[PDB]
Amino acid sequence: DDQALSTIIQLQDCIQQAIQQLNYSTAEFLAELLYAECSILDKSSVYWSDAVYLYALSLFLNKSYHTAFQISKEFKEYHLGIAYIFGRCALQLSQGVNEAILTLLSIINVFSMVLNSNLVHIPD
Amino acid sequence: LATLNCLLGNLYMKLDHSKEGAFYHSEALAINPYLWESYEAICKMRATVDLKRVFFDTLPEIMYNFALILRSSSQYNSFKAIRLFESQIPSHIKDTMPWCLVQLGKLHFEIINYDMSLKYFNRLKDLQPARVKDMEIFSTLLWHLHDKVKSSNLANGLMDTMPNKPETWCCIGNLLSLQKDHDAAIKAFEKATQLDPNFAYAYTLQGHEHSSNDSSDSAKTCYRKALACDPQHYNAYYGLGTSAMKLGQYEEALLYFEKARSINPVNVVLICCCGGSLEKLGYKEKALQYYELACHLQPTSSLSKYKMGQLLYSMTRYNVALQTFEELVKLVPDDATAHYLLGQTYRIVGRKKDAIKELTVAMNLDPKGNQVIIDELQKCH
Amino acid sequence: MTSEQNSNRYWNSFHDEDDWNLFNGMELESNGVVTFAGQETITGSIFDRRITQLAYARNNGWHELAL
Amino acid sequence: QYDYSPFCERNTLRESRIDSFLKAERAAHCLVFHKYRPDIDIMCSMLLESVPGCNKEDLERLSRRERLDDIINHETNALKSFWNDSGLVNSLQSHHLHEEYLLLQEELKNVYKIKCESLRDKCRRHYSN
Amino acid sequence: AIERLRLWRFDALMQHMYRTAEYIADKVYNISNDPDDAFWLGQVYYNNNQYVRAVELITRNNLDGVNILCRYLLGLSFVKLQRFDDALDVIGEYNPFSEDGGIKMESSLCFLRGKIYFAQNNFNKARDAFREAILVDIKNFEAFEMLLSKNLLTPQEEWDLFDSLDFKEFGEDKEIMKNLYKINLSKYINTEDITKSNEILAKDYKLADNVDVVRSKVDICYTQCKFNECLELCETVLENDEFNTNILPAYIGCLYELSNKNKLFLLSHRLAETFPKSAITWFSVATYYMSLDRISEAQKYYSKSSILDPSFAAAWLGFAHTYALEGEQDQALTAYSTASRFFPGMHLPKLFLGMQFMAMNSLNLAESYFVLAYDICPNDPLVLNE
Amino acid sequence: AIERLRLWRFDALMQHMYRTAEYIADKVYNISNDPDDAFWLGQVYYNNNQYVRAVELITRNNLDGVNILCRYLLGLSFVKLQRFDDALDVIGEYNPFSDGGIKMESSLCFLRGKIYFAQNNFNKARDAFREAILVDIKNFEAFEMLLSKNLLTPQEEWDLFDSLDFKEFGEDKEIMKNLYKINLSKYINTEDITKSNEILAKDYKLADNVDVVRSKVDICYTQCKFNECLELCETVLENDEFNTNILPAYIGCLYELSNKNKLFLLSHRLAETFPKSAITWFSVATYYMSLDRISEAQKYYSKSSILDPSFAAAWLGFAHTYALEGEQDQALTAYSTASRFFPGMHLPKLFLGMQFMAMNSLNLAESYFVLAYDICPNDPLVLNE
Numbered sequence A: 001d002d003q004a005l006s007t008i009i010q011l012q013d014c015i016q017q018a019i020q021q022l023n024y025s026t027a028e029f030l031a032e033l034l035y036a037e038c039s040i041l042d043k044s045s046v047y048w049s050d051a052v053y054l055y056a057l058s059l060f061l062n063k064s065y066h067t068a069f070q071i072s073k074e075f076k077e078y079h080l081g082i083a084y085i086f087g088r089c090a091l092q093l094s095q096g097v098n099e100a101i102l103t104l105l106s107i108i109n110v111f112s113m114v115l116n117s118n119l120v121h122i123p124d
Numbered sequence B: 001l002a003t004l005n006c007l008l009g010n011l012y013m014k015l016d017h018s019k020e021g022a023f024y025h026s027e028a029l030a031i032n033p034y035l036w037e038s039y040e041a042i043c044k045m046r047a048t049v050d051l052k053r054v055f056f057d058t059l060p061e062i063m064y065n066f067a068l069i070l071r072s073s074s075q076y077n078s079f080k081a082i083r084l085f086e087s088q089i090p091s092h093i094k095d096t097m098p099w100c101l102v103q104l105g106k107l108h109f110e111i112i113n114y115d116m117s118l119k120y121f122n123r124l125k126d127l128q129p130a131r132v133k134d135m136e137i138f139s140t141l142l143w144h145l146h147d148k149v150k151s152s153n154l155a156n157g158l159m160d161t162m163p164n165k166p167e168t169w170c171c172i173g174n175l176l177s178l179q180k181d182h183d184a185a186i187k188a189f190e191k192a193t194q195l196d197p198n199f200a201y202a203y204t205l206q207g208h209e210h211s212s213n214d215s216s217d218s219a220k221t222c223y224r225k226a227l228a229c230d231p232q233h234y235n236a237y238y239g240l241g242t243s244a245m246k247l248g249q250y251e252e253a254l255l256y257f258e259k260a261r262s263i264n265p266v267n268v269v270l271i272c273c274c275g276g277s278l279e280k281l282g283y284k285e286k287a288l289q290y291y292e293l294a295c296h297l298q299p300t301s302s303l304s305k306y307k308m309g310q311l312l313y314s315m316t317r318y319n320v321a322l323q324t325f326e327e328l329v330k331l332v333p334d335d336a337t338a339h340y341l342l343g344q345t346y347r348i349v350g351r352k353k354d355a356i357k358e359l360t361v362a363m364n365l366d367p368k369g370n371q372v373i374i375d376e377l378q379k380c381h
Numbered sequence C: 001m002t003s004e005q006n007s008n009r010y011w012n013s014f015h016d017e018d019d020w021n022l023f024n025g026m027e028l029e030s031n032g033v034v035t036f037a038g039q040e041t042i043t044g045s046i047f048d049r050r051i052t053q054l055a056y057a058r059n060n061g062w063h064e065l066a067l
Numbered sequence D: 001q002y003d004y005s006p007f008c009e010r011n012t013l014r015e016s017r018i019d020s021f022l023k024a025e026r027a028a029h030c031l032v033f034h035k036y037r038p039d040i041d042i043m044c045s046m047l048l049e050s051v052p053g054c055n056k057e058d059l060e061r062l063s064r065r066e067r068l069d070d071i072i073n074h075e076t077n078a079l080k081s082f083w084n085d086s087g088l089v090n091s092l093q094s095h096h097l098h099e100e101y102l103l104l105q106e107e108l109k110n111v112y113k114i115k116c117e118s119l120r121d122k123c124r125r126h127y128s129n
Numbered sequence E: 001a002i003e004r005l006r007l008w009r010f011d012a013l014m015q016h017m018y019r020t021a022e023y024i025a026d027k028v029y030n031i032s033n034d035p036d037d038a039f040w041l042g043q044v045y046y047n048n049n050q051y052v053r054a055v056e057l058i059t060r061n062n063l064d065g066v067n068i069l070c071r072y073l074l075g076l077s078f079v080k081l082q083r084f085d086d087a088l089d090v091i092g093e094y095n096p097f098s099e100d101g102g103i104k105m106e107s108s109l110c111f112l113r114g115k116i117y118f119a120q121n122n123f124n125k126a127r128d129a130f131r132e133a134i135l136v137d138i139k140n141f142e143a144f145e146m147l148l149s150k151n152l153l154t155p156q157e158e159w160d161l162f163d164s165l166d167f168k169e170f171g172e173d174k175e176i177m178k179n180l181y182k183i184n185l186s187k188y189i190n191t192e193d194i195t196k197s198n199e200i201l202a203k204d205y206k207l208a209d210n211v212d213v214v215r216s217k218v219d220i221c222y223t224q225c226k227f228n229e230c231l232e233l234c235e236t237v238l239e240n241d242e243f244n245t246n247i248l249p250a251y252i253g254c255l256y257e258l259s260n261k262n263k264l265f266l267l268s269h270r271l272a273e274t275f276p277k278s279a280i281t282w283f284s285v286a287t288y289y290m291s292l293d294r295i296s297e298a299q300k301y302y303s304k305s306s307i308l309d310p311s312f313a314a315a316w317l318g319f320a321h322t323y324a325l326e327g328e329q330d331q332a333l334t335a336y337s338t339a340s341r342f343f344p345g346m347h348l349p350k351l352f353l354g355m356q357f358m359a360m361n362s363l364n365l366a367e368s369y370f371v372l373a374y375d376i377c378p379n380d381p382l383v384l385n386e
Numbered sequence F: 001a002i003e004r005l006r007l008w009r010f011d012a013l014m015q016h017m018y019r020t021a022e023y024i025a026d027k028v029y030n031i032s033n034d035p036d037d038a039f040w041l042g043q044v045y046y047n048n049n050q051y052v053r054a055v056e057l058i059t060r061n062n063l064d065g066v067n068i069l070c071r072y073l074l075g076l077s078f079v080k081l082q083r084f085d086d087a088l089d090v091i092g093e094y095n096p097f098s099d100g101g102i103k104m105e106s107s108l109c110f111l112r113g114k115i116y117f118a119q120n121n122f123n124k125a126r127d128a129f130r131e132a133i134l135v136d137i138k139n140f141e142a143f144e145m146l147l148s149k150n151l152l153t154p155q156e157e158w159d160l161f162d163s164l165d166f167k168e169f170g171e172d173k174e175i176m177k178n179l180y181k182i183n184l185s186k187y188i189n190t191e192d193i194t195k196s197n198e199i200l201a202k203d204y205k206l207a208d209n210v211d212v213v214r215s216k217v218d219i220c221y222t223q224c225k226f227n228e229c230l231e232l233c234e235t236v237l238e239n240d241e242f243n244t245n246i247l248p249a250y251i252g253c254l255y256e257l258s259n260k261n262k263l264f265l266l267s268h269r270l271a272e273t274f275p276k277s278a279i280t281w282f283s284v285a286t287y288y289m290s291l292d293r294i295s296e297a298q299k300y301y302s303k304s305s306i307l308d309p310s311f312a313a314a315w316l317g318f319a320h321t322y323a324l325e326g327e328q329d330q331a332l333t334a335y336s337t338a339s340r341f342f343p344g345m346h347l348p349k350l351f352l353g354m355q356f357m358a359m360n361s362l363n364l365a366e367s368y369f370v371l372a373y374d375i376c377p378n379d380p381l382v383l384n385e
Helices: A005-020 A024-037 A046-061 A065-074 A081-092 A097-111 B003-015 B018-029 B034-044 B051-056 B059-074 B076-086 B098-112 B113-128 B134-147 B151-162 B166-179 B183-195 B200-212 B216-229 B234-247 B251-265 B269-282 B282-297 B304-312 B318-331 B335-350 B351-365 B368-381 C002-012 C017-022 C049-060 D015-033 D056-063 D068-082 D094-115 D119-127 E001-014 E018-031 E033-048 E049-058 E070-083 E084-091 E104-118 E123-136 E142-150 E156-164 E171-183 E191-204 E211-223 E225-236 E248-258 E261-274 E280-293 E294-307 E312-324 E327-344 E347-359 E364-376 E381-385 F002-015 F017-030 F035-047 F051-060 F069-080 F083-089 F104-118 F122-136 F139-147 F152-165 F167-182 F192-202 F210-222 F226-239 F247-256 F262-271 F278-290 F296-308 F315-325 F328-340 F346-358 F362-373 F380-384
Strands: C034-037
Touching: A005 A024, A005 B059, A005 F226, A024 A046, A024 E033, A046 A065, A046 A081, A065 A081, A065 E084, A065 E364, A081 A097, A081 B269, A081 C034, A097 C017, B003 B018, B003 B034, B018 B034, B018 D056, B034 B368, B034 F315, B051 B059, B059 B098, B098 B134, B113 B134, B134 B151, B134 B166, B134 D119, B151 B166, B151 F262, B166 B183, B166 B200, B183 F069, B200 B216, B216 B234, B234 B251, B234 B269, B234 C017, B251 B269, B269 B282, B282 B304, B282 C034, B304 B335, B304 D119, B318 B335, B318 E225, B335 B368, B351 B368, B351 E327, B351 E364, B368 E327, B368 E364, C002 E294, C017 C049, C049 F017, D015 E171, D068 E191, D068 F362, D094 E049, E001 E018, E001 E033, E001 F167, E018 E033, E018 F139, E018 F210, E033 E049, E033 E070, E049 E070, E070 E084, E070 E104, E084 F247, E104 E142, E104 F362, E123 E142, E123 E156, E123 E211, E142 F017, E171 E191, E171 F226, E191 E211, E211 E248, E211 F017, E225 E248, E225 F017, E248 E261, E248 E280, E261 E280, E280 E294, E280 E312, E294 E312, E312 E327, E327 E347, E327 F315, E347 E364, E347 F139, E364 E381, F002 F017, F002 F035, F017 F035, F069 F083, F069 F104, F083 F104, F104 F122, F104 F139, F122 F139, F122 F152, F167 F192, F167 F210, F192 F210, F210 F226, F210 F247, F226 F247, F247 F262, F247 F278, F262 F278, F278 F296, F278 F315, F296 F315, F315 F328, F315 F346, F346 F362, F362 F380
Parallel strands: none
Antiparallel strands: none
16 A cells, blocks of 8 residues: 555656657556556545546547547546546547536536646646 | 657668667667557567566566566467466456456467457457457457357447448458358458558458469468568468468478468467478478477367378377377367278277277268278278 | 158158258268258258257347348 | 466366366477476566567677678578578478578569559549449 | 245245246345255256256356255256256366265266266266266166166176175165166076066065066067067056157067057057157157158158157167168168267177178178177177077 | 155155156155155156156046145146146136145146136136135235236236235245235336335345346336336346346337347347247347338247237237338237237337327327326326327
């Protein structure tokens, strides 16, 4: 448990580093591994939501829109970036747009769960 | 100064030569160990690094274990990778993570164990219905199982979700080849490779379908295109070798077979084919050497034991030949021509009681050639 | 020749529908290899229980290529 | 007792397959390990150790960022790289090397050409496909 | 409490109340995770031809191996489902236990293993498995009767096996059970001893005119070609049970010898309206054609009888007779070779194949098959005459 | 002395070695010469799929008049041998009588009810099943078979459930009453069913039970909660995929969600699992309906309907295939026939009323819609129509 948190933080730093450069397959593998590792952690933990968002973002970047859309749809309410990825996937595919409106309207109206984070590509 | 080396490696791998690209991928890995794309590029070829120095000089241990798995799979030594999956990579990573499941399914499918691969990456398909990468393996497994309903499920689902990925058209062509049609499978494969080039698997299946269509030149051209797309691909080498035996020219047949076994050392079909090429060339002493590895490499394989028995009977090692044929019959009783060799070896050693029963079995198996079997009974007494 | 077919039909009337379907064109060769006719073919050696069940399968079972 | 759980998730394997896997696995390891049980143990300057088709000399060249007997040396060396250190070439007869060599660049050259239109006409290929 | 539910469930299952038995078995297994209740549920699934559900029940929790009985149930369900590989997997290649008033649990497992080996046509291992099953527990009888009926042992070996096994378990019923088992042994060896044993069993005990004793008398008369006694004993037994499948083959052979065309037509018609699926009916119809000299047409009906039931010597041997009787001699050899290979342990196919080779005027092979048949059966006038 | 042989025979029946079971039963019967032994041997013959042996052996010495269970075994053998008039003659049309185990009278009355159901005189079948359930409550078939084929309107089903007494169970009645209360119809008194579901969930750890899951799935089906249907039934089907009670609700919910891949996989597996069941052919027809191929569904619903007379889904699907095909004249008779075989089920009448709408004959549709709405006050189809 003492080193368990350190590994997750190191994976997060590595995934942001990989996404910063135009290296996407490595980002894919790191996001898959982190998402698999965070499975034991409870859903209430911020780490699970962060890993799910990172995995969904990596899936979106690698043109595999269907998998990203499904992954974001599983936990669209938990995080803001997951809602962003779900909305972008809906725009790219025109599937399930109504869920995107009912989620995005609530998230924007409340702003003006987890809403703010330091990760990459967090929407404003 | 880590991604530049990966880019240089990628351009080198794509354009002319893989050696410099692998070197530059290794240099990039030297700069940073967490460049998994570099590892996949390395493992596309049969190249490896000193992982202990790379990853050390529990997250690094997990990465080290995964690198060992991928290296073993690329080197085609699946038993070790299964064992590391057994000991390391605990269950809560192993089952959920789709890439580990993909690799494990490919490992089990590499061995004759067929059902368990089906189970593993059928759970994969359930986890990620929209997964499109690496489904040609599922297509080849369904073709090998001679099952049509799950192939239809795969094809319908993939066509409905992604109409344009080349694997989808490859699956369509594989089902068409499975059912009755060869020209329709060929048409599906040209569509698959036109939409996405550099896909060597499409050319390999094109060559296989052309070979099954009794068109040698088209199959050769398709296989050569496959090699142009991918420098290392044993399936197309095996296809070219089979075409060469059909054409009778054993020289390039052995050449192609030898090239294929180099990247896939553990495969009974390739080993037996290489041994047959040697036997046609006349190297009796060397051909048995490969056959000896094949029988010990994987028992319960009819072809390897049959080739063993024919070769030993050819040069009269009857003492081991008799036991090879007996265990061949034990593992399968329906071989017609094998029981003939059982009887011949039994009559040569001089145990008539077994010879009569074995030739009776042979007469049962072959109504047409019974007269020659009756002749052997005459020589028996 | 006509009388023997008549007696054959008379004794053939004692079948179930599925059993009759299986035996509709059934021919048994001397060495025991068995040929099954699909109204594909199921040529397999007899005295093994599995081949017959397989014959029943594609007889009354549902198979659909589905594009 | 020999552990066979990872080879099949079904907790029981028939004894025929238990010896079948054990005999096959040991031989496969003994081939790689030598140019014993698997559950007992699984273990065993340029960072780059090997590249298929790369000899120690090629690897050395990379660090620098680069008559009958002599041709026989080139005869064997060419098939050393392409066949990934195959041991059967030393058992091959010398005159059988020649025809395999001649077919080598002939096939290799054919790859070289492969690896290397009016407006109205070139539209048909996209529409018809 | 739970005991009342358990006894009610057992009674419901016993009374062919399948729905109540299934519901209460499910309830009791949910209340307590006792594997015997899971066994009861699997048995309920088994009775109404629902094998796969029982298989998934017993496999889902991996409760097999904890207790032997559910392992046996799962293996039997597989052997009914023809997935013999998994049945051999769960049971094991050999005996794992090798060093109550009921048959020992382990012996039944050996019987199931022997049945599995017999299904895969691995007769050599099936013989050993059945022998071990009968030696371990004398309470079992299914293995003994399977071995005797399918002729996996020569009569001398069968007698040696019977003498080897003891009757200490039975205790008070030792002599009656010994006679009861001895009724079913093979003939051609010391038939006077079987006659004395059944005579003792007839008068001393109430078992004077039971099914198996008259069946043994019929088998004895048929072996000694006492065809008159065939018909009296067979009629006197069929008048009680018109469809006793244990005696019908001998009855059909005796009538065929007597050429009672009319009686055979009545029997064939009677079995046609009742048991179309069973191969006995079609064998009877085929031999009706046989008695009227319709070999070519009866060929097909022997084929049908053979297909509807494997491991039946009568159908395939008659089919080979249809080949050998009229022309087409070439493939009668293959037919008799199939008879010999697929039905090991009987001297009759070997004798027939040797005589057919003799019919070809080829001698040495005929002598070899004749000595093979003599090896299988030492006491038979047919083989010695040949 | 006989007791040891009796235990041997019982063990032979337990371990399913039928030849030895018959051997020992015959020996012990010849020794003792008592009717219970004949019952044992007849049961052996029954289990061995040889019904003829059992009926002749029981009827040879006229044992049906000696004991009460031997006549039952002979009657049941006649039942599955496809003889009914002589079976009911042996058992008797009426009631001749009007510790563990169950009373034999309830079993005989249930057998008579099954004969009556086979003979289509449905009112007598209702009378027989009601008499069987009131005489004895342990006979769960007398309840489940009655409710399964919808022989009676749910109102009188609830009335009879209230009338019947659980007192003779004693200590176990506290749980048995709730288990029986689970299985009645769901349209009326729905809230009590839910309360009993939670009652079972607490203090008895029976939440994992399959039948509780079947009750919840049917509850969700009544209110058309098809998504909850799919999730729960997918949870239960993963454990066991061929529970014939569960499957019809799952097929209906799949067809409502209009997904063809899952239905195709399940239908093709069930086809190769249970070839002679009507459920699999009904599933194939449903798959074709999800694919809108009316022509094949015609035949594959006809086959399922022929296989099971008490399968109302087949009639409604069959008439739906007519209706969607283009012709409605035959669908009219089909929906009317479905309504007549199953009195008290509103849905075939509702579908028939929609067909009247399709034929612009509203006068009968008014009454038919009213009768359907009499028991379905809250559901989208009735109000929409």
